[PDB]
Write a protein that binds this DNA or RNA. Structure first.
Length: 863
DNA sequence: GCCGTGCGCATTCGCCGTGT
DNA sequence: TTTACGTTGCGCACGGC
RNA sequence: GACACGGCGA
């Protein structure tokens, strides 16, 4: 059959008159009404895309995949698996010849059969009308075969799968491709003969229908999901069931709004929910984006006045569309040949259709999927600024993720990519003045990518290009030099402001938002908390006449070691017995440091080889991780570019390099590395399930991790292991299932997830608190009211940048000067469960010699 | 008690969309 | 209804002469 | 507390 969805009544969201007078008088009916029209639209747009997506999935037999099918699919699956099992019993206890189907349904697991039956037939019915029990049965029988055949090369003697065939499967997409690919793997698993040598004996269409038939029957027997329409004959979906998916899908499409900016200041936050938008719609905003309610309730009665003042001041910043920039963006994006790098192609590419051509395809392919993806987004951010082009000002509601970071709620907001940032500017401008001008030029220098050199040099760079800049402002569609800069629209956006000053002088009212970005917040904060004077200089926390480059500092240290090895290290080998590689059974050319240190130097190791690795350090990236980055980022790309033969055995080459980067960075920034290991031990111990080694009883259960940021924001890290069992099918994807063991309730913490998350999560929560403090500081001590916020990037209008430049450094300083985050963290969990004698807990790492006051005179820290 | 096998894991969080 | 190159060790867990 | 594939922000 077909699922009939119906639209929702969003008119309800059109707030009452008493709450409406809250807006009117405040902002006036025109807007007050417009806003509510806007919020109502958000919900309609959301419903629009759900219905669309749905209809798409339906016309592809993927109904079972939709979140509307799930609630029902999960009620049936058990009833089916049970019937299948019961059946297998009757058929056994009954003397004589067993049904022709029994034998085949024995290959795959019962639960697999049940899902493939629910799913496959669930499609056939909603797709076409060939809902004939003979056609459906063949569909089921065919799917059951392929799962059985290509399933063994996974469940049966086949780990080679989770190695040489698992990841390569996730690449191919579509029931069709994955099959044409397994037929392939299958054929070559013979040259080696994994499953021994039992070549899958085809099934023969006859039986492949006795099976499909049995299943249908079992399905009908266990649950009236489908009904056999009396008549060759056909089947159709049970009404109560069809009307069910329609109901879930209806509700689902009303809690999926496509949030937009506000036309009036957003609604102040006074609680954990309800702030931001004014209507009291279906999806009320939550101050915090917690996973699974309950956590959001923890914030219910927490006293954190400063956190509130911040989220409010922040979303109270008025913005407007940048028309001049919108003017060029609208058109230059319709060009066949755009001067701006990687700004989609209105039209799709093509490939040269005549080892060789293999890539001539894989290339254009990848390249297009990615482009079609950027296009969808660009067009939306575009066909949306045009909608707010004329408004006097717009606003964006804010809330935070669970660590405290502040995210704007609307889909189109100031924290997007370059084209989005360029289209937006601040509404409340002010006469630029002598300094706003100074900073404006620096903002412009940074937009051109010239940011790795001192301030006078950045000013010179801009002064030097006066005429280029003047030209781009006069005729952006003609000159286009701005389009070749690192952030073209933001740069262009600065060109129009820079020209304004020329034409009008310093009394000129400017509102362009000048960004002050920190360099590696993670490392800046660890170094700052541990007083690391060496890692702190590397990230500009200390005054210098030169701008420090942590990546350059690391690459440099790599060559220091690259020399010491090229002529003073290991030599080749041919593999021995249980040496360093645990215990392999053969022998190759295990290259030695001197061999490796040779190829790298014979390559030219610069900052770009280390860039990637230092960036992800704060996300827990270690030596193994680097092996992946260097290989993918540096080698492969160079090997494929044909211009790199230093490497013969690249995997060995990367292990070494990855080892070197780890070493040096491990001495460059110790506070970071050190504070990270500490954080991980603490997490490791609280998540541990302590059982007495004697009685085997649990003395202390696994624990979650909690802490409060310096501005009073509490954070609870409690990753949890999957509730239900995850079963993955070869082609028909995965599906959950209730726990086989009743004595498996609770919830269960995920100790591994607690360890790999704590360090980055802790640091992020610190960055956030820093941002929040900075905002409140700036607003109270200096009176600034407009803020562009991107986690570790703070911005204002030129006339206000000197005071933000100040504020951002005074808060970093005041905060770390007023409290020890690590020792504070300890004092939180030490007592409150952790007991027994788990005291293998390392001592807080030692503080260094960094004098935080210096950060005040530091010019390149920004944050 | 203390290792040969054996195996689980590699980078965090927030978001949006899906050629035939 | 045809593109998907690339595969290495270190740790925390059982049982066991 | 969600497949995979692609894109973006820190």
């Amino acid at each position: 059959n077909t699922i009939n969805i119906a639209k929702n009544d969003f008119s309800d969201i059109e707030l009452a008159a008493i709450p409406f007078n809250t807006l009117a008088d405040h902002y006036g009916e025109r807007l007050a009404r417009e806003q509510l029209a806007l919020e109502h639209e958000s919900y309609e747009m959301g419903e629009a895309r759900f219905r669309k997506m749905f209809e798409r999935q339906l016309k592809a037999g993927e109904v079972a995949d939709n979140a509307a099918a799930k609630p029902l699919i999960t009620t049936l699956l058990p009833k089916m698996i049970a019937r299948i099992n019961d059946w297998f019993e009757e058929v056994k206890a009954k003397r004589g010849k067993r049904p022709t189907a029994f034998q085949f349904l024995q290959e795959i697991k019962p639960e697999a059969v049940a899902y493939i039956t629910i799913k496959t037939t669930l499609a056939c019915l909603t797709s076409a009308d060939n809902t004939t029990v003979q056609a459906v049965a063949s569909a089921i029988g065919r799917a059951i075969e392929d799962e059985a055949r290509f399933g063994r090369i996974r469940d049966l003697e086949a780990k080679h799968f989770k190695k040489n065939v698992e990841e390569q499967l996730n690449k191919r997409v579509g029931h069709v491709y994955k099959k044409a690919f397994m037929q392939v793997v299958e054929a070559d698993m013979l040259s080696k003969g994994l499953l021994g040598g039992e070549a899958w004996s085809s099934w023969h269409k006859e039986d492949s229908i006795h099976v499909g038939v049995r299943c249908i029957e079992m399905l009908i027997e266990s649950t009236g999901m489908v009904s056999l329409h009396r008549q060759s004959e056909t089947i159709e979906l049970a009404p109560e069931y069809a009307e069910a998916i329609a109901t879930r899908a209806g509700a689902l499409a009303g809690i999926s709004p496509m949030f937009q900016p506000c036309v009036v200041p957003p609604k102040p936050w006074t609680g954990i929910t309800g702030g931001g938008y004014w209507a009291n719609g279906r999806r009320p905003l939550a101050l915090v984006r917690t996973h699974s309610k309950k956590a959001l309730m923890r914030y219910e009665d927490v006293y954190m006045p400063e956190v509130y003042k911040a989220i409010n001041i922040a979303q109270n910043t008025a913005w407007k569309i940048n028309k001049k920039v919108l003017a060029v963006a609208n058109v230059i994006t319709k060009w066949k040949h755009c001067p701006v790098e990687d700004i989609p192609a209105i039209e799709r590419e093509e490939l040269p259709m005549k080892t060789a051509w293999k890539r001539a395809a894989a290339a254009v392919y990848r390249k297009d999927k990615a482009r079609k993806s950027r296009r969808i987004s660009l067009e939306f951010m575009l066909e949306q600024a045009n909608k707010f082009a004329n408004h006097k000002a717009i606003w964006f509601p804010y809330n935070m993720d669970w660590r405290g970071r502040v995210y704007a709620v609307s889909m189109f907001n100031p924290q997007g990519n370059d084209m989005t940032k360029g289209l937006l500017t601040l509404a409340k401008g002010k006469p630029i003045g002598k300094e706003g001008y100074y900073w404006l030029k620096i903002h412009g220098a940074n937009c051109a990518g010239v940011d790795k050199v001192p301030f006078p040099e950045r000013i010179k760079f801009i002064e030097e290009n006066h005429e280029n800049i003047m030209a781009c402002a006069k005729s952006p569609l003609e000159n286009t030099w701005w389009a070749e800069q690192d952030s073209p629209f933001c740069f262009l956006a600065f060109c129009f402001e820079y020209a304004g000053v020329q034409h009008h002088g310093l009394s000129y009212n400017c509102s362009l938002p000048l960004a002050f970005d920190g360099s590696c917040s993670g490392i800046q904060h660890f170094s700052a908390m541990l007083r690391d004077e060496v890692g702190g200089r590397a990230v500009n926390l200390l005054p210098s006449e030169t701008v420090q480059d942590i990546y350059g500092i690391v690459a440099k240290k790599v060559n220091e070691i690259l020399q010491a090895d090229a002529i003073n290290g290991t030599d080749n080998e041919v593999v021995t017995v249980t040496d360093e590689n645990t215990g392999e059974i053969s022998e190759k050319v295990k290259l030695g440091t001197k061999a490796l240190a040779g190829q790298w130097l014979a390559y030219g190791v610069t900052r770009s080889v280390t860039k990637r690795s230092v960036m992800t350090l704060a996300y827990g990236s270690k030596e193994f991780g680097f092996r992946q980055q260097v290989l993918e980022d540096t080698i492969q790309p160079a090997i494929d570019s044909g211009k790199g033969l230093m490497f013969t055995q690249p995997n060995q080459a990367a292990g070494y390099m990855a080892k070197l980067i780890w070493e040096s960075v491990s001495v460059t920034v110790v506070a970071a590395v050190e504070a990270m290991n500490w954080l991980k031990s603490a997490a490791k111990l609280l998540a541990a399930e302590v059982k007495d080694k004697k009685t085997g009883e649990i003395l202390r259960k696994r624990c979650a991790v909690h802490w409060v940021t310096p501005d009073g924001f509490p954070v609870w890290q409690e990753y949890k292991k999957p509730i239900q069992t995850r079963l993955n099918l070869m082609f028909l994807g995965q599906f959950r299932l209730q726990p086989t063991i009743n004595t498996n309730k609770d919830s269960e913490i995920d100790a591994h997830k607690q360890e790999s998350g704590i360090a980055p999560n802790f640091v992020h929560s610190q960055d956030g608190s820093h941002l929040r403090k900075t905002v409140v500081w700036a607003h109270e001590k200096y009176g600034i009211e407009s803020f562009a916020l991107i986690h570790d990037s703070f911005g204002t209008i030129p006339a206000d940048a000197a005071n933000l430049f100040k504020a951002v450094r005074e808060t970093m300083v005041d905060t770390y000067e007023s409290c020890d985050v690590l020792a504070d963290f300890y004092d939180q969990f030490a007592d409150q469960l952790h007991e027994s004698q788990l005291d293998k807990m390392p001592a807080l790492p030692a503080k260094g010699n960094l004098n935080l006051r210096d950060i005040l005179e530091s010019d390149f820290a920004f944050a």
